Design a protein around this ligand. Sequence first.
Ligand SMILES: *[C@@H]1O[C@H](CO)[C@@H](O[C@@H]2O[C@H](CO)[C@@H](O[C@H]3O[C@H](CO)[C@@H](O)[C@H](O)[C@@H]3O)[C@H](O)[C@H]2NC(C)=O)[C@H](O)[C@H]1NC(C)=O
Ligand SMILES: *[C@@H]1O[C@H](CO)[C@@H](O[C@@H]2O[C@H](CO)[C@@H](O[C@H]3O[C@H](CO)[C@@H](O)[C@H](O)[C@@H]3O)[C@H](O)[C@H]2NC(C)=O)[C@H](O)[C@H]1NC(C)=O
Ligand SMILES: *[C@@H]1O[C@H](CO)[C@@H](O[C@@H]2O[C@H](CO)[C@@H](O[C@H]3O[C@H](CO)[C@@H](O)[C@H](O)[C@@H]3O)[C@H](O)[C@H]2NC(C)=O)[C@H](O)[C@H]1NC(C)=O
Ligand SMILES: *[C@@H]1O[C@H](CO)[C@@H](O[C@@H]2O[C@H](CO)[C@@H](O[C@H]3O[C@H](CO)[C@@H](O)[C@H](O)[C@@H]3O)[C@H](O)[C@H]2NC(C)=O)[C@H](O)[C@H]1NC(C)=O
Ligand SMILES: *[C@@H]1O[C@H](CO)[C@@H](O[C@@H]2O[C@H](CO)[C@@H](O[C@H]3O[C@H](CO)[C@@H](O)[C@H](O)[C@@H]3O)[C@H](O)[C@H]2NC(C)=O)[C@H](O)[C@H]1NC(C)=O
Ligand SMILES: *[C@@H]1O[C@H](CO[C@@H]2O[C@@H](C)[C@@H](O)[C@@H](O)[C@@H]2O)[C@@H](O[C@@H]2O[C@H](CO)[C@@H](O)[C@H](O)[C@H]2NC(C)=O)[C@H](O)[C@H]1NC(C)=O
Ligand SMILES: *[C@@H]1O[C@H](CO)[C@@H](O)[C@H](O)[C@H]1NC(C)=O
Ligand SMILES: *[C@@H]1O[C@H](CO)[C@@H](O)[C@H](O)[C@H]1NC(C)=O
Ligand SMILES: *[C@@H]1O[C@H](CO)[C@@H](O)[C@H](O)[C@H]1NC(C)=O
Ligand SMILES: *[C@@H]1O[C@H](CO)[C@@H](O)[C@H](O)[C@H]1NC(C)=O
Lengths: 240, 340, 46, 40
Amino acid sequence: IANQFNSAIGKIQDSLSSTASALGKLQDVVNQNAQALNTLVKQLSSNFGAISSVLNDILSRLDKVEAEVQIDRLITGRLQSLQTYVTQQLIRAAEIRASANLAATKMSECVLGQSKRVDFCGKGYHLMSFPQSAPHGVVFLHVTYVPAQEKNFTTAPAICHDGKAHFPREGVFVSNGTHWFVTQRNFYEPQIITTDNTFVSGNCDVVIGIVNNTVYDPLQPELDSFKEELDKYFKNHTSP
Amino acid sequence: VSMTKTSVDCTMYICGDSTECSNLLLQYGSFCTQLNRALTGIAVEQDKNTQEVFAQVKQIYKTPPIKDFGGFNFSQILPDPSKPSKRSFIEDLLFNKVTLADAGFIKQYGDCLGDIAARDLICAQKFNGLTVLPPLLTDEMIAQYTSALLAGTITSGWTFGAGAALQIPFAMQMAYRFNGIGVTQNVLYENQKLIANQFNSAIGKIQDSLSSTASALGKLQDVVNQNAQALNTLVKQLSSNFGAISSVLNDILSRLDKVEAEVQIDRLITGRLQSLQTYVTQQLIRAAEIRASANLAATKMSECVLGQSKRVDFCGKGYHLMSFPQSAPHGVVFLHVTYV
Amino acid sequence: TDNTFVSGNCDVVIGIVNNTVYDPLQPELDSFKEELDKYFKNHTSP
Amino acid sequence: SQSIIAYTMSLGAENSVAYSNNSIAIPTNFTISVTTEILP
Ligand SMILES: *[C@@H]1O[C@H](CO)[C@@H](O[C@@H]2O[C@H](CO)[C@@H](O[C@H]3O[C@H](CO)[C@@H](O)[C@H](O)[C@@H]3O)[C@H](O)[C@H]2NC(C)=O)[C@H](O)[C@H]1NC(C)=O
Ligand SMILES: *[C@@H]1O[C@H](CO)[C@@H](O[C@@H]2O[C@H](CO)[C@@H](O[C@H]3O[C@H](CO)[C@@H](O)[C@H](O)[C@@H]3O)[C@H](O)[C@H]2NC(C)=O)[C@H](O)[C@H]1NC(C)=O
Ligand SMILES: *[C@@H]1O[C@H](CO)[C@@H](O[C@@H]2O[C@H](CO)[C@@H](O[C@H]3O[C@H](CO)[C@@H](O)[C@H](O)[C@@H]3O)[C@H](O)[C@H]2NC(C)=O)[C@H](O)[C@H]1NC(C)=O
Ligand SMILES: *[C@@H]1O[C@H](CO)[C@@H](O[C@@H]2O[C@H](CO)[C@@H](O[C@H]3O[C@H](CO)[C@@H](O)[C@H](O)[C@@H]3O)[C@H](O)[C@H]2NC(C)=O)[C@H](O)[C@H]1NC(C)=O
Ligand SMILES: *[C@@H]1O[C@H](CO)[C@@H](O[C@@H]2O[C@H](CO)[C@@H](O[C@H]3O[C@H](CO)[C@@H](O)[C@H](O)[C@@H]3O)[C@H](O)[C@H]2NC(C)=O)[C@H](O)[C@H]1NC(C)=O
Ligand SMILES: *[C@@H]1O[C@H](CO[C@@H]2O[C@@H](C)[C@@H](O)[C@@H](O)[C@@H]2O)[C@@H](O[C@@H]2O[C@H](CO)[C@@H](O)[C@H](O)[C@H]2NC(C)=O)[C@H](O)[C@H]1NC(C)=O
Ligand SMILES: *[C@@H]1O[C@H](CO)[C@@H](O)[C@H](O)[C@H]1NC(C)=O
Ligand SMILES: *[C@@H]1O[C@H](CO)[C@@H](O)[C@H](O)[C@H]1NC(C)=O
Ligand SMILES: *[C@@H]1O[C@H](CO)[C@@H](O)[C@H](O)[C@H]1NC(C)=O
Ligand SMILES: *[C@@H]1O[C@H](CO)[C@@H](O)[C@H](O)[C@H]1NC(C)=O
């Protein structure tokens, strides 16, 4: 588990030393904010119907009443260019706020906790996440357990034994084809079916697909070998 | 999950092929490029939204030919091969409830000129430089993704969410669900025919209700209605004079000389440019509501379809057992199953 | 004693009630005491 | 020998899951995977 973590962290480092565009979500924000400012500077080139874009070339050429009609045209278009920029930035600020609120929720639930929420903290069953800072952003390195090398088994919902139906406490019943076990559900680790691994409910008539097997009572041989301890004392005490 | 993608030729809307108006529109600089960039950014995001929600499976899972799911009957929500799109029975019900306007799938002149040209708003939008663009995923591809989400769920439980799909019998998956709500698994196996009949009957009531009431998909119809009403508002703003002698740009150019027409055309450019800036701002504000809704639908897909949620009222009312996705026009329907 | 766990005495808990709590190992050893007893009684006969 | 090609996109590889009323798959092993999420 330690070598697999250490190797997976090595592949984060290798990818971030090899691919370019992976931080494209953060580069897109820098690109959009730069392109919006370049667009706003470029709108100063626009005449908006005036004799020039250059405010000094209006004032160097025209008297007070001719200039004021030309300057009004530049005020109108430049004021509209700011109202457009600020509306677009107010609309983008809400996308960045939603993204920061999500990142704060992943900091709480994936870094300060372990999440049961599917696909909230990477792909697999969440173990833990590590925050890393990035320009205008956060990176979460999410660690997950992914189950790897599955095998087919025969299964049953219940075992029938003493005319009683038995169910797993924790786990699932499985057969390799000849013998029956209980295993934990997320990792194959087979155990003999016992009155400690299982609980009883009702008789074998109700459950669709119940199978017959022995269910071991570990108190039984602890008193069966004790039943032979009494007999050897009784048979030795035939001697007097 | 999405809204209709729109593009505008800002020059065909404002100037409608007048070269005189086109020369005057260049004096406003970057605004028509900004408007096209903003609508292109909205349109790319409708495909993104649909990929966040529906493309949550690695593999296109198939159900087995032997439908032995322990007495639970999924036939109304599984694919039906008798149709060109392999949608479910409930997905065909859903696709009949919401009425669309333009899918983007080619309008080819003879279907739009002559006798049809009067009795249509879509040809009046298109003859003014306004176009709907098709989705990247077709409705058949969204139905294949939804088929794979449902086949993955009923054959393998939550395991296809975390890794490889691991098969488990359906009544044993349902016994896992029961443990996950704090009910012991013998309560499922001892009541299995009852739990199956209650599920089968509750799915029958979804079919009956969707066959009976009109306005249930009003959340999706409101989105189609808003996008259609915004495009009809934008087309109707071409009737406005904005203080010019006419709204008809050709009647200005037919009756006025070069210098008199420029003063009237600038008045129409000013108001038509403001009409596009209003439309694009309103559509940028809407696109954020649809995004937030698609991010919620993608989270419900991960946490209610690919898992069992412990979150209260996140996956229906009751204790969550499992959810089934169904595709709908620009949306998703979750059929949430709960223990009450 | 399989359905329940012990913690402390009955003085502390507000609203605790008296009932029997069954030990299922008890009759499994009492019937094993009666098994010993009939063996001892029978083996008095020689 | 390069050119631009146009195609209907694949949604994924197809998979018939091996479902049966009494078959289960259980993982005999695991992997630890580390995956990156980036947020503005
Ligand atoms: C299903 O799982 C069973 C338990 O793991 C397994 O049965 C076991 O098989 C091994 C041989 O492969 C036996 O091993 C013993 O063989 C003799 C017994 O006298 C000894 O000399 C050996 O030292 C060794 O202990 C086990 O005794 C046997 N266990 C039981 C409880 O029968 C099955 O073979 C598996 N079946 C399939 C289809 O894989
Ligand atoms: C699982 O184990 C059960 C207990 O050993 C076993 O139940 C027994 O099944 C047989 C055949 O159905 C019955 O045999 C008797 O059936 C009637 C009288 O009941 C007579 O006509 C027959 O000649 C014969 O005597 C047993 O009565 C029945 N026992 C009980 C307690 O119900 C199951 O058959 C086993 N199932 C499997 C799949 O292995
Ligand atoms: C799963 O639920 C399905 C919906 O209730 C159900 O499908 C329905 O089944 C009945 C009986 O086969 C069909 O009834 C028709 O049967 C034949 C068809 O040729 C006619 O002669 C009859 O007069 C009658 O109309 C329904 O048409 C059918 N409905 C649909 C929408 O397919 C399944 O049978 C259920 N599956 C199981 C395993 O019980
Ligand atoms: C629950 O069961 C308890 C055990 O049987 C029982 O406790 C006993 O309560 C009585 C009455 O309070 C006490 O009786 C004696 O009280 C003093 C000496 O302690 C004498 O003056 C009395 O004459 C009498 O002998 C018991 O001593 C006490 N036993 C213990 C171990 O504390 C509770 O009363 C029962 N409660 C209910 C609600 O049923
Ligand atoms: C569970 O899966 C593990 C992989 O995630 C696997 O560990 C890997 O086991 C093989 C040997 O079976 C190792 O291969 C090396 O073995 C020796 C050196 O020790 C050399 O002869 C080989 O050429 C090769 O270098 C892998 O290194 C090892 N991987 C890790 C991360 O340790 C387990 O064996 C699997 N366990 C079970 C019970 O299935
Ligand atoms: C689990 O079993 C399935 C199918 O059931 C098996 O069918 C036999 C082939 C045999 O293995 C029996 O013990 C089982 O009852 C396996 O699915 C097959 O996979 C191969 C590719 O590896 C494919 O060519 C077949 O068409 C598949 N058959 C079916 C019916 O799906 C599957 O590989 C097994 N899975 C694991 C994890 O071992
Ligand atoms: C499982 O399906 C088989 C047919 O393949 C059938 O004979 C058997 O009765 C079914 N068992 C259960 C538990 O449903
Ligand atoms: C009885 O058995 C014990 C061992 O169990 C032995 O030491 C002793 O000698 C035996 N005595 C008789 C009388 O058999
Ligand atoms: C419960 O309320 C009754 C009065 O109705 C009171 O006599 C009793 O002591 C209370 N018991 C507990 C456990 O609080
Ligand atoms: C009593 O003990 C004798 C041996 O002395 C034995 O043969 C017999 O089976 C025993 N019977 C009982 C009922 O214990």
